[PDB]
């Protein structure tokens, strides 16, 4: 029944601040030491902080010393991790893990939470620009013809591409995003259709961006060559 929920992740510029929380449920919060464990995207786990059961002894990792500050609230069932002077090498996923020990020499984090993501980059928010990709020679005939629309230069990554407003789910697959030289994401989605169904189509992909709306629709048509 033990369940740890953390909230507070988001995007923040370098040299800012952010306060992550974690709410416990199903066990006595005022009897267990609690940690904060972070994991860079695609790297190994790393320990960040720890606070004893009554906010007496607090241990920090060597790389975050002098910048973080852990706290607790034994009555409101939470522990907080203030951040300051964040850097670009800080983006990661933060877990809040309860602490288990046998008494003398065994120490492990048994009930890990769920996790939240912290993005720290100097790029600014900007709406995507959607560019079409019309079918051409060598990319049609055969058995099927492939076409799609290109989404370019959007800074946060809640981008959803729906072709018939969520009704066309037969030959659609969306490729992973690309980290360009600066902080700028790009992706392309393509659909394979028979090369004899032209003239009767509904191929107008929908692109929606959550932070900045920038709602836009583009139609794809086949041109010569």
């Amino acid at each position: 029944q033990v369940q740890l929920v953390e909230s507070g992740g988001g995007v923040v510029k370098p040299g800012g601040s952010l306060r992550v929380s974690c709410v416990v449920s199903g066990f006595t919060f005022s009897s267990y030491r609690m940690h904060w464990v972070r994991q860079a995207p695609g790297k190994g786990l790393e320990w960040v902080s720890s606070i004893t059961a009554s906010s007496s002894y607090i241990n920090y990792a060597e790389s975050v010393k002098g910048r973080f500050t852990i706290s607790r609230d034994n009555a409101k069932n939470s522990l907080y991790l203030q951040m300051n002077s964040l850097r670009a090498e800080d983006t990661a996923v933060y877990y809040c893990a309860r602490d288990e020990n046998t008494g003398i020499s065994h120490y492990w984090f048994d009930p890990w939470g769920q996790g939240t993501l912290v993005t720290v980059s100097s790029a600014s928010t900007k709406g995507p620009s959607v560019f079409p990709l019309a079918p051409s020679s060598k990319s049609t005939s055969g058995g099927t013809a492939a076409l799609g629309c290109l989404v370019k230069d959007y800074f946060p990554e809640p981008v959803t591409v729906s072709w018939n407003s969520g009704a066309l789910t037969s030959g659609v697959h969306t490729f992973p995003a690309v980290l360009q030289s600066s902080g700028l994401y790009s992706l392309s989605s393509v659909v394979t259709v028979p090369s004899s169904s032209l003239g009767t189509q509904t191929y107008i992909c929908n692109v929606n961006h959550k932070p900045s709306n920038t709602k836009v629709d583009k139609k794809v048509e086949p041109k010569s060559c």
Partner: peptide, 9 residues
């Protein structure tokens, strides 16, 4: 002696 628990109300 070994102190297995350090803080608890």
């Amino acid at each position: 002696p070994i102190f297995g628990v350090i803080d608890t109300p």
